[PDB]
Amino acid sequence: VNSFSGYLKLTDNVYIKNADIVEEAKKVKPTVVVNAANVYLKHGGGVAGALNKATNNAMQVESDDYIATNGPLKVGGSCVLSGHNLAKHCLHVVGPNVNKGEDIQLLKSAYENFNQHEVLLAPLLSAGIFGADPIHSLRVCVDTVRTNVYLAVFDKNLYDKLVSSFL
Ligand SMILES: NC(=O)C1(CNc2ncnc3[nH]c4cc(Br)ccc4c23)CC1
Numbered sequence: 408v409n410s411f412s413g414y415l416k417l418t419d420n421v422y423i424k425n426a427d428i429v430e431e432a433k434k435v436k437p438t439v440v441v442n443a444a445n446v447y448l449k450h451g452g453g454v455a456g457a458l459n460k461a462t463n464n465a466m467q468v469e470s471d472d473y474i475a476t477n478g479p480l481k482v483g484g485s486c487v488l489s490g491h492n493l494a495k496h497c498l499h500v501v502g503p504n505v506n507k508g509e510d511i512q513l514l515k516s517a518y519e520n521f522n523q524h525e526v527l528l529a530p531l532l533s534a535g536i537f538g539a540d541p542i543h544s545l546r547v548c549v550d551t552v553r554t555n556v557y558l559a560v561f562d563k564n565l566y567d568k569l570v571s572s573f574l
């Protein structure tokens with residue numbers, strides 16, 4: 408039993424809710440919140456901009472030190488950093504950005520990072536400003552993630568479409 412509330416169960420291990428991931432993280436304080444990161448950990452907009460704003464820019468400060476030491480992530484890759492006031496840990500995961508021409512096949516590799524964590528609060532990777540079809544992202548999530556994932560979808564209209572079209 409965990410503290411996530413109001414989710415629709417899609418499969419054995421995948422759950423979904425119309426929610427602001429920032430507000431959900433602040434309420435649940437999950438062990439792991441997933442950020443929709445880019446390779447530079449520049450948290451300017453979308454989910455990343457919102458999460459970073461909620462940390463009062465502490466996420467960005469920590470991220471800049473990480474990049475200065477380690478260099479950029481790979482598309483499809485991840486790193487574990489602090490969750491600040493939102494979670495114990497933040498798993499920064501880089502899905503392909505279609506608006507940059509990146510290979511959508513890397514979306515499966517991106518979701519594989521979730522399997523290193525028993526339970527996660529997450530957005531749909533490569534959705535939103537990353538330009539992928541969220542219906543496809545949900546399909547890849549369900550077919551790739553084996554650990555327990557609680558998906559927060561900000562847009563109510565999109566949430567209803569994701570549920571109603573789910574196979
Ligand atoms: N834009 C979308 O509808 C999707 C991706 N964005 C988010 N997904 C889940 N929680 C989120 N909290 C946010 C807060 C701010 Br401010 C901006 C964006 C998001 C966000 C669901 C596809």
Ligand SMILES: [Cl-]
Pocket residue numbers: 452453454534535536537
């Ligand atoms: Cl977004």
